[PDB]
Amino acid sequence: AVVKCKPTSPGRRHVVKVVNPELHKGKPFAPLLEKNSKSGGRNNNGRITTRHIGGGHKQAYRIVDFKRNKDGIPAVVERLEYDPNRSANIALVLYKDGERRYILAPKGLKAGDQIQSGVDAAIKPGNTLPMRNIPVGSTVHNVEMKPGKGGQLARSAGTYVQIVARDGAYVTLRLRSGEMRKVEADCRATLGEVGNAEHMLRVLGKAGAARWRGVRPTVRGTAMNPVDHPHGGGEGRNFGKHPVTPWGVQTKGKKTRSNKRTDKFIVRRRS
Amino acid sequence: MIREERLLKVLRAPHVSEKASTAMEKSNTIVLKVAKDATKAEIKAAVQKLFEVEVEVVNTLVVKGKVKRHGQRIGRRSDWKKAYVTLKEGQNL
Amino acid sequence: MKRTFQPSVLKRNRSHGFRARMATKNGRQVLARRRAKGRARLTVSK
RNA sequence: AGGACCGAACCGACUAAUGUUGAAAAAUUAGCGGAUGACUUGUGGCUGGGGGUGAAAGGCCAAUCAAACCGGGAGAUAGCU
RNA sequence: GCUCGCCGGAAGACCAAGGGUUCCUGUCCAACGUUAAUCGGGGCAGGGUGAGUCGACCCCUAAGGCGAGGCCGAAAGGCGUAGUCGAUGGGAAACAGGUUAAUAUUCCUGUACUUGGUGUUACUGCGAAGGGGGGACGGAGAAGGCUAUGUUGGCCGGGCGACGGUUGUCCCGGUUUAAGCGUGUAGGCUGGUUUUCCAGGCAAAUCCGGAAAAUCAAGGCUGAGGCGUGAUGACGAGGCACUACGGUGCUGAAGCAACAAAUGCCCUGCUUCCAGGAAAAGCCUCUAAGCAUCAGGUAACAUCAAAUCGUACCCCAAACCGACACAGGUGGUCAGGUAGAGAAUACCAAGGCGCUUGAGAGAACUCGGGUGAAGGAACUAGGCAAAAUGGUGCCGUAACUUCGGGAGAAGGCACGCUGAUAUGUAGGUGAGGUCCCUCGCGGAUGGAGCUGAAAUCAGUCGAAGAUACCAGCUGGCUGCAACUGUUUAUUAAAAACACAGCACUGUGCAAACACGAAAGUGGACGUAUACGGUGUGACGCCUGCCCGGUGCCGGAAGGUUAAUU
Every domain of chain C and the residues it spans: 1-46
Query: Which segments of chain A does DSSP mark as H helices, in order?
Result: 207-212
- Those residues whose C-beta lies under 8 Å from the C-beta of residue B22, and which sit 6 or more positions away, are none
Could you tell me if A199 and A210 lie in one domain? Answer: yes
Nucleotides of E under 7 A from a protein CB: 17-21, 43-52, 62-66, 76-77, 79-80, 87, 100-102, 106-108, 132-134, 136, 198-201, 208-210, 273-279, 305-311, 320-322, 328-330, 402-404, 482-484, 490, 496-501, 504-516, 520-523, 525-539, 550-554
User: Is the distance between the Cβ of A82 and the closest atom of strand D smaller than 7 Å?
Assistant: no
Q: How far is the CA of B66 from the C1' of E22 (A)?
A: 12
Q: What is the CATH number of the domain that holds A13?
A: 2.40.50.140
Q: What is the domain count for chain B? A: 1
Domain boundary among A113, A134, A165: A113
User: Is the distance between the Cβ of A46 and the closest atom of strand D smaller than 7 Å?
Assistant: yes
Could you tell me if A233 and A267 lie in one domain? Answer: yes
User: Is the distance between the Cβ of A37 and the closest atom of strand D smaller than 7 Å?
Assistant: no
Domain boundary among A165, A194, A223: A194
Residue among A70, A138, A143 at smallest CA distance from A100: A70
Give the closest nucleotide to A10 (alpha carbon vs C1'). Answer: E483
User: Is the distance between the Cβ of A43 and the closest atom of strand D smaller than 7 Å?
Assistant: no
Give residue numbers, 208 to 267 of A, with CB < 7 Å from strand D.
208-209, 211-212, 216-217, 219, 223-229
Q: Are A196 and A202 in contact (CB under 8 A)?
A: no
Which residue segment(s) compose the domain that A95 sits in?
Answer: 1-113
User: Is the distance between the Cβ of A73 and the closest atom of strand D smaller than 7 Å?
Assistant: no
Give the closest nucleotide to A81 (alpha carbon vs C1'). Answer: E276
Which residue segment(s) compose the domain that B59 sits in?
Answer: 2-93
* DSSP character at residue A190: E
Domain boundary among A143, A164, A194: A194
For this entry, resolution in Å reads: 4.5
3-class SS of residue B22? helix
- Fold for domain C1-46? Helix Hairpins (1.10.287)
Q: What is the CATH number of the domain that holds A224?
A: 4.10.950.10
Q: Which residues of C3-19 are buried (b: 16+ CB within 10 A; e: fewer)?
A: eeeeeeeeeeeeeebee
Q: Are A113 and A76 in contact (CB under 8 A)?
A: yes
| Pairwise CA distance, residues C46 & C39, whole Å | 12
Could you tell me if A17 and A99 lie in one domain? Answer: yes
Q: Are A80 and A111 in contact (CB under 8 A)?
A: yes
Q: What is the domain count for chain A? A: 3
| Beta-strand relationship, A188-191 and A139-141 | antiparallel
Q: Are A76 and A114 in contact (CB under 8 A)?
A: yes
CA distances (Å), origin A157, targets A26, A100, B5: 22, 22, 81
Residue among A67, A29, A112, A83 at smallest CA distance from A196: A83
- Alpha carbon dihedral A215, A217, A218, A220, in 10-degree steps, equals 170
- Alpha carbon dihedral A196, A197, A199, A202, in 10-degree steps, equals -130
User: Is the distance between the Cβ of A7 and the closest atom of strand D smaller than 7 Å?
Assistant: no
| Pairwise CA distance, residues B31 & B59, whole Å | 10
